[PDB]
Amino acid sequence: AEFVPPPECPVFEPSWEEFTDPLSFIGRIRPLAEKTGICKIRPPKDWQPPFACEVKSFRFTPRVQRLNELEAMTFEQVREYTLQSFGEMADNFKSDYFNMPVHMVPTELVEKEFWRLVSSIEEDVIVEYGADISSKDFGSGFPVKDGRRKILPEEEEYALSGWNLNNMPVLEQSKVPWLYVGMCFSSFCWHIEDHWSYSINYLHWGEPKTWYGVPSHAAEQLEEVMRELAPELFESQPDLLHQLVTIMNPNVLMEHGVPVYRTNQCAGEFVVTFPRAYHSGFNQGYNFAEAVNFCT
Ligand SMILES: CC(C)c1c(-c2cnn(C(C)(C)C)c2)[nH]c2c(C#N)cnn2c1=O
Numbered sequence: 276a277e278f279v280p281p282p283e284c285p286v287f288e289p290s291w292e293e294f295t296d297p298l299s300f301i302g303r304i305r306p307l308a309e310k311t312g313i314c315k316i317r318p319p320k321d322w323q324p325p326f327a328c329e330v331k332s333f334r335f336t337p338r339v340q341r342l343n344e345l346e347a348m349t350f351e352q353v354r355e356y357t358l359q360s361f362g363e364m365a366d367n368f369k370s371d372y373f374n375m376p377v378h379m380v381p382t383e384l385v386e387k388e389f390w391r392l393v394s395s396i397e398e399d400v401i402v403e404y405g406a407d408i409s410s411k412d413f414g415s416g417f418p419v420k421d422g423r424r425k426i427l428p429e430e431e432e433y434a435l436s437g438w439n440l441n442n443m444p445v446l447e448q449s450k451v452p453w454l455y456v457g458m459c460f461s462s463f464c465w466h467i468e469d470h471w472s473y474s475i476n477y478l479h480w481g482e483p484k485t486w487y488g489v490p491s492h493a494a495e496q497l498e499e500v501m502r503e504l505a506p507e508l509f510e511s512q513p514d515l516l517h518q519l520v521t522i523m524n525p526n527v528l529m530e531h532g533v534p535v536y537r538t539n540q541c542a543g544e545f546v547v548t549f550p551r552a553y554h555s556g557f558n559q560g561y562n563f564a565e566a567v568n569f570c571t
């Protein structure tokens with residue numbers, strides 16, 4: 276059977292008056308976005324933050340990911356890349372897999388093929404991605420007043436903007452942004468954030484990032500479906516460890532009454548996940564994202 280795309284999550288296009296402050300805006304859209312788990316925010320057209328990462332020194336060792344790892348139970352280790360050398364590998368993989376220029380591959384085709392490969396036992400596809408990349412060690416994608424890099428006058432409005440993820444509040448009453456370097460089919464499984472916190476993700480550039488989200492009111496139903504279909508060796512594991520292998524086709528959740536919403540996060544767009552909103556997804560191609568957990 277072919278993959279059935281879930282319904283689209285809400286997309287918001289705030290004006291310059293509404294793009295004022297993120298927390299104020301997120302609080303106003305909450306009555307709708309909390310009912311879908313995730314939402315997308317498109318900044319005004321002329322809000323274009325410049326990429327501040329030192330690409331001349333950005334070197335990292337990605338990790339290997341096999342799409343049908345869970346179906347194999349029912350050695351692939353890697354080289355150091357630069358941001359450019361990784362992009363050349365990522366584009367070569369996608370163009371060779373689909374036999375067409377990378378920007379010509381439709382997003383619905385990659386989505387259908389991704390979930391086919393996840394459940395396919397007759398074809399093993401291996402991809403790589405950069406995760407667990409702290410902006411404190413590699414530098415943020417947004418301009419910042421750090422004491423280790425120079426910002427221009429044109430960059431100052433973005434270093435001080437409330438939508439700069441380095442300026443989000445991360446202290447709960449009684450933390451730095453992380454980086455993601457993706458390629459086609461690189462994916463993250465279903466999870467919620469620590470302390471059930473909010474999370475905001477900005478796609479600096481590259482090909483889209485496909486999201487799936489579940490509202491918080493269905494969190495227990497997802498976990499029940501997950502426990503009923505997960506392998507017996509992983510069902511008894513704590514959720515912190517179990518969330519490392521909780522890959523599941525969204526149609527499986529939808530067939531059991533779990534509401535799922537999707538979206539294609541494009542370059543220059545924000546995605547916000549609400550408290551206890553399970554989410555997962557995959558990258559359509561070579562891209563660069565930055566994310567942080569914040570609190571209200
Ligand atoms: C494919 C990669 C680069 C990726 C991952 C991911 C994959 N594995 N990991 C661990 C936890 C280190 C094992 C993280 N997460 C996310 C989110 C969220 N939330 C949003 N985009 N995104 C990604 O692009």
Ligand SMILES: [Mn+2]
Pocket residue numbers: 466467468474548554
């Ligand atoms: Mn997350």
